[PDB]
Amino acid sequence: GYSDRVEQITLGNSTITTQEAANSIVAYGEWPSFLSDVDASDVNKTTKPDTSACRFYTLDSKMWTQGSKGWCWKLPDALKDMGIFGQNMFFHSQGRTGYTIHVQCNATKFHSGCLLVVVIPEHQLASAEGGNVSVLYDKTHPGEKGIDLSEADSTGPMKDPLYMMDGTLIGNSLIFPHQFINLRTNNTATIVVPYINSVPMDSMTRHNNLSLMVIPIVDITATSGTTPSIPVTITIAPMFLELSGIRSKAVI
Amino acid sequence: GYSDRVEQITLGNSTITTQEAANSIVAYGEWPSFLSDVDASDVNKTTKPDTSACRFYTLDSKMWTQGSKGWCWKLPDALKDMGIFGQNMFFHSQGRTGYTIHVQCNATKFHSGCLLVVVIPEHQLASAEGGNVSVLYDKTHPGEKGIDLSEADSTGPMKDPLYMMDGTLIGNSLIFPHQFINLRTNNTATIVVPYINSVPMDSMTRHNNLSLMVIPIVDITATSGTTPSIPVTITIAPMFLELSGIRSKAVI
Amino acid sequence: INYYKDAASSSSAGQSFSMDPSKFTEPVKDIMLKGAPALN
Amino acid sequence: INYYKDAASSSSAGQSFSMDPSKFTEPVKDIMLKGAPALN
Amino acid sequence: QTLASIKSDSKHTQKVPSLTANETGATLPTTPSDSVETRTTLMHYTGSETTLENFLGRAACVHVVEIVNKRPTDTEEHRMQLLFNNWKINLSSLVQLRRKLEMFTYVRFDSEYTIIATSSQPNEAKFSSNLTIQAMFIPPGAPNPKKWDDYTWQSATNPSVFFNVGKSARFSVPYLGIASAYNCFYDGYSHDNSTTPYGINVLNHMGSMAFRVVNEHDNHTTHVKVRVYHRAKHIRAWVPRAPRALEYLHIGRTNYKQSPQNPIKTRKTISTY
Amino acid sequence: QTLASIKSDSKHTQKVPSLTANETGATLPTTPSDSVETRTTLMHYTGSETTLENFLG
Amino acid sequence: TNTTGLGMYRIPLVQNMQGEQVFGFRLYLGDGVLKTTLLGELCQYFTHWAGSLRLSFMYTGPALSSAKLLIAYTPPGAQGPTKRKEAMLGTHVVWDIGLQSTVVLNIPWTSGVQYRYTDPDTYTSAGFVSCWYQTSLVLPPQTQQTVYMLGFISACPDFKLRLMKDTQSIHQ
Ligand SMILES: Nc1nc(-c2ccccc2)nc2[nH]nc(Nc3ccc(C(F)(F)F)cc3)c12
């Protein structure tokens, strides 16, 4: 019986195996793919790193405890320091990616709680100072360390998850590709996202595509014992990496 | 009239144009190519960086003056710090390359002199100390800076070009793919070299393939004036780069 | 009748199209059926 | 539809034409070919 | 005709359409007939009224400028005297429109403009005058007018329109975006730098529209307000998103107040009707 | 539809489109594909906007 | 500064210099060195620019002289280049001085945005153009001279312009 709860993902030279998972999501119903001749405008033979880049990378885990506000990662920024992908990002003048985003969170039958995992394109952030203040580059491109909504700042973006980070309400964030992790049912969530942009290819350093939000909706509790602490781990891979134009390594 | 003296090489996103050149050499009569299924033994989908790596790289020029002994570069070592190629070299457990090696040296009709450009596979070097002494890693892997045979050392390889660097005589080095640069006739030499090894693929860090020797046979002179100084520039590109196995960046 | 040969000048012509909510309501790899377990 | 019978009154009608840059870029008696020596 | 519901009688099956898992992120297309007994009935509706084209393709005020007709004063820049006025093109100035466009991430359309002018004479006037108003496009790289009547206004290459107060201008402008669609949001910067503007403003190089009274002074000062309306046509949009709940502060920016009012009406008890 | 560029791979030929002489007064119609590797792509442009008629009319 | 006259169209090359920069500029079709060229003048009548540019250089020194030059294009997002080692990582050509006196470098369209502005605008910067001494300038023995190159620019067949506007070349 090929239960829908059990999946294996093989990508490049890495695999993910799950036993308690919900059906994976293909954002907007479109599987990731390469740029067509019709869409293309950049007159350069492209580079396709293939399986040297299109493999799973794992980001440092974070602890989910009572009082946690949630976390935010930017793509492709989060992977800028990882593997050949991270290096290619600074040599190629432009490129395009799709992603497989996998969020993990283990628990027992005695635990309760719920994470909301959402992928938001072009998630332009509000500044902590409001007014005419823009969020500085340094605070929108943290790499592997995501934006911890639990941390105080005055120069960073606003951190209150009710309003996401842009003035919309979290209740309506479900319009975006999303999946929930209920500790009682599933320990993983998987979202596959095609390249989404107004242009064929774009900078991979001055602009983010996708903003991965992981926001707890229901705090972690347990039937008994002290406040629980459950790690949350995020694993991300490029799908159809396609790059163009060679330059000296970009300096940020 | 498509004169044999004029050539254009286009490779990746870079070009070389020459007006005074000898016919290029294809070492051993075999054009570089990808590993076949029959030859392959490594069970991994390979990576083909294509034109992101297979482009021309230029190494720092060196001055050729009276008294110069010649210079030696190792491949792929010379390119270890250049572009995405250099980065890929430390992430991939094994690989294979072919090369296009181009040596340039300008002069006028009033100059005399002759360089011998030779590509020698597996050029195992003799140590300056002789006896049981091995040449240390640090002195066989100098990167862009080649081994200047004009420089003194006591820990490096022997530097006397008469015996190359291994006890054979230079007179017989012409058995290897080679080309001469006579300042009176041509200012360039071009050699294309296929992957040559006992194995399908190999380490690109613990082992060199090809050793590029540029040794003056006839000193630079001029019909009149003071001792001339002519720069010698070397440009090298991978042909059919093929890589396999992903690991954390190697540390040397 | 169009009176201008510059297409932007055209009035807001168009047809109604069948809706396709599946892009937003059922973006899943494995097809779910009504009445079937969501969690197999 | 033209409403006036005096041709100057006609609107700016016309077709697009294939470009012919050779008049300004290759005005040479002896045809030059890409890849061939310019100076034979 | 499309049916709204089909006759359905009591069921006692192992098939359970009322029970699912939102965990999957999917919303299954269930019907009333999957819960209760139903009767066959038609929709009598095509949904044409809710097409994207109707939602966005209605005129809306975008911007209002004030220009005056007065004897020029030599001690002040003509722009400061309001002898002419420059409107940097955007659709984000007035929230009633911005809010709708904000509901999509990428939007593509042609534009239709309507420009309406009204005069006023809040002074000891002897008579009223119907002024002629000029509106001119000034795309990036084009010269910006400095004096109320310098050479710039010749409009040799810049599209422009003349109309009278009490009358209106109308024209179409084709999609002018560089990309395949206009971005409503931009999670990035103009370039790789620590200090640089963030957000959609960096993509807004639409240029400016300049307004002028083309008449000479006429003894008294006449104030003219010019209202510009915009309507989108042939509209396409991609990637829908949640609407903004909090008040807007500035153009382009998504900033909000330091201590925003929670835009959810409250009640005494979870069970209060 | 008119192509902007056609796929072109690395070359090693005696034909040299990148080398010429402006002395002749001619500008040869060379392309990006004569210098670097390229990928096939369409123009999606007719040039109608740049016709003399629009420039002056 | 201090180049009044036709000297502005002459790029000097000097003897015994190696690895140094010959010239470089920021690639604008608006207010850069290309401002007054025909592409400059035509582009100043349009807002949007797309497609490939062609640069060409012609050597005017002694028939007995020689040099190799590196001409390179650095895509958007990069800085400088300040060293040849950086320039060589972009799109480049190595130019051998000989019978054929002119080199043509077609600068490919590398933008991730379908159109770029003719006016300077950070978001659509076209990057940089530079030239370095691949070897060095060599003149006959016992001579010492400065030789010059002439730079040229034209559009590639794949060149697009949209949305007309007035120029900033008129002052009354
Ligand atoms: N100017 C823009 N450019 C881009 C963009 C540029 C490059 C790549 C991708 C997107 N996105 C935009 N989103 N909103 C923009 N502002 C806007 C658009 C139209 C109009 C009006 F009214 F003219 F239609 C007025 C203001 C805008």
From TrEMBL, chains A, B:
It is found in: Host cytoplasmic vesicle membrane; Host nucleus; Virion. Belongs to the picornaviruses polyprotein family. Homodimer. Interacts with host GBF1. Interacts (via GOLD domain) with host ACBD3 (via GOLD domain); this interaction allows the formation of a viral protein 3A/ACBD3 heterotetramer with a 2:2 stoichiometry, which will stimulate the recruitment of host PI4KB in order to synthesize PI4P at the viral RNA replication sites. Interacts with capsid protein VP1 and capsid protein VP3 to form heterotrimeric protomers. Protein 3AB: Localizes the viral replication complex to the surface of membranous vesicles. Together with protein 3CD binds the Cis-Active RNA Element (CRE) which is involved in RNA synthesis initiation. Acts as a cofactor to stimulate the activity of 3D polymerase, maybe through a nucleid acid chaperone activity. This is Genome polyprotein.
Automatic annotation (TrEMBL), chains C, D:
GO terms for molecular function: structural molecule activity. It comes from the Viruses. One of its GO terms (cellular component) is viral capsid. Forms an icosahedral capsid of pseudo T=3 symmetry with capsid proteins VP2 and VP3. The capsid is 300 Angstroms in diameter, composed of 60 copies of each capsid protein and enclosing the viral positive strand RNA genome. This is VP4. The lineage of its organism: Viruses, Riboviria, Orthornavirae, Pisuviricota, Pisoniviricetes. The chain holds residues 30 to 69 of 69 of the full protein.
TrEMBL record, chain F:
It comes from the Viruses. It is found in: Host cell; Virion. This is Genome polyprotein. It comes from rhinovirus B5. The chain holds residues 16 to 72 of 288 of the full protein.
